[PDB]
Design a binder for this molecule. Structure first.
Ligand SMILES: *C(=O)[C@H](C[C@@H]1CCNC1=O)NC(=O)[C@H](CC#C)NC(=O)/C=C/c1ccccc1
Ligand SMILES: *C(=O)[C@H](C[C@@H]1CCNC1=O)NC(=O)[C@H](CC#C)NC(=O)/C=C/c1ccccc1
Lengths: 303, 303
């Protein structure tokens, strides 16, 4: 028993992290087979950051402008190309530690683990959710770009995020591993701001089920609600609408606890309207929305 | 910027995890050089759990009673011995992936990363604090015993915890890697219960400093307090006394933010007496005490 924000074990990804330097800019790269992937803004200079033309900067570069170090073995760059907001640096050695992997783009509301790195060396690992507004609430300092987010399924790493920047609100923005940004952000210099965020309703419900599985029951009631009358309340509190598919996804947790999804919705409505009155759920005084139903089942299997 | 509960990268520890089976009991072991360490209750059976005599059970065992698997390469046990609540199984191969390591016992109030494992295979990684009552608030299911907690300093893994059991309150208890329990617990069957816990005051202060470093300032004031008048309030709210050494440890955070430790104490006193009135700090509606000053500096270096 117990419930914690749990990251995937990071070893398979640690073996892929390299350091990429171009000019006086050093950041992190991801070394899979004989390609290193990194953010294309590694080729920018201070004088072209408001709106660099990345195609010009790249045509003016050669292979020898890119210094790639794995630990401190130097990898020779033998080819370079741009794919959207990511650079692909072909190197003369295939990474012997290349895991089975996929490049997957995730959906708002899904979670993943982040391996924060600096200078090619892993610093720490933590769990993030892709917010409905396509930002993530992470922990990233100068030098962390090129750090990646991932899930593991069996022994296949599905990479889903590469870090590019921090917004003025302190949240973070990046791309998938094909270099396509999550959300309406660009790797330049704008006053760029995220769209208004909402709470991931299905995840809050999943987390209430985790709480029940862990003996927290004070918020339950006999009330049930209709999906319509629940979504009326959700809209008022800036929660995303709940769909029948969300109810279906919550099925196994429903069956494990014997609490119908719409009964748990009745509990959430009461929590939204009355708050907690000084009590906690799984150690939180806020309703937590960064656990998916899968995160709960994975951690709470058999109580 | 940003602040998250961050674990250490788990790769160096993943390479040490093995599966240890004796009888019908399978749990996790830690393979360093030519020794596998695991909880001694792996030799228990259902009929001797209230108070096993572990010296009898062990004398009645042979090397061939212990099946040790790394991945699925079988390691031959060539020697066995008991060290307090841990077994040391000598095996015929030194672990090629053995990192530089230390066996360190930590203090209440210090943090560490846990690599939760089942059947020798790492499941996830998360950060824990050793509570003042020598329990940890983790996430452990049946089969997780032998999972270890650790810190990393440079490239040396300091192992500090091996998991043995869950208490009735849902918290967890274990030993250091010499097999000496943290706290007044035993690896048998008792109605055993933890002593009353307290809040780690120096860590709450460190976390307030992290919040300031991340732009959360609403809880500050010009008030300052004396260390004595603060500890009077702390005692009332079940917080541990703050010492001059704690004030010294908080020095660098004090200097980085320009807020004197005793000024930050004045803020904490107000927070204890008035609560937050519906606001949050670093995304929490509770005062967080599982970040050490070191955790903050490590994550918040240079804003
Ligand atoms: C890459 O390492 C770095 C990561 C951020 C540094 C500070 N915290 C980060 O996550 N990426 C950048 O610095 C990019 C570079 C480009 C283009 N730029 C930004 O993050 C811009 C931030 C900003 C904030 C407020 C106003 C303007 C720009
Ligand atoms: C080892 O894998 C296991 C870990 C716990 C299982 C359930 N969650 C755990 O963290 N260790 C045990 O099961 C040990 C074995 C011994 C001795 N026993 C307990 O954890 C006893 C728990 C308990 C709770 C309430 C009343 C009595 C006993």
């Amino acid at each position: 028993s117990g419930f914690r924000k749990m990251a995937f074990p990071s070893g398979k990804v640690e073996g892929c992290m390299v350091q990429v330097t171009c000019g006086t800019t050093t950041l992190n790269g991801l070394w899979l087979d004989d390609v290193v992937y990194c953010p294309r803004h590694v080729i920018c200079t201070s004088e072209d950051m408001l709106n660099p033309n990345y195609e010009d900067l790249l045509i003016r570069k050669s292979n020898h402008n890119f210094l790639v170090q794995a630990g401190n073995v130097q990898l020779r760059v033998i080819g370079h190309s741009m794919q959207n907001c990511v650079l692909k640096l072909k190197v003369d050695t295939a990474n012997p530690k290349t895991p089975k992997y996929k490049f997957v783009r995730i959906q708002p509301g899904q979670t993943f683990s982040v391996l924060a790195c600096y200078n090619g060396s892993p610093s720490g690992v933590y769990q993030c959710a892709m917010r409905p507004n396509f930002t993530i609430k992470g922990s990233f300092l100068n030098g962390s770009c090129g750090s990646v987010g991932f899930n593991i399924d069996y022994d296949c790493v599905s990479f889903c995020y590469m870090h590019h920047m921090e917004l003025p609100t302190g949240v973070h923005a990046g791309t998938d591993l094909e270099g396509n940004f999550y959300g309406p952000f660009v790797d330049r210099q704008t006053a760029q701001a995220a769209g208004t965020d909402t709470t991931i309703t299905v995840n809050v419900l999943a987390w209430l089920y985790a709480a029940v599985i862990n003996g927290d029951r004070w918020f339950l009631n006999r009330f049930t609600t209709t999906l319509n009358d629940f979504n009326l309340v959700a809209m008022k509190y800036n929660y995303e609408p709940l769909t029948q598919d969300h109810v279906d996804i919550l099925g196994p947790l429903s069956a494990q606890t014997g609490i119908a999804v719409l009964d748990m919705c009745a509990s959430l409505k009461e929590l939204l309207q009355n708050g907690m009155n000084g009590r906690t759920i799984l150690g939180s005084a806020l309703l937590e929305d960064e656990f998916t139903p899968f995160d709960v089942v994975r951690q709470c299997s058999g109580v």
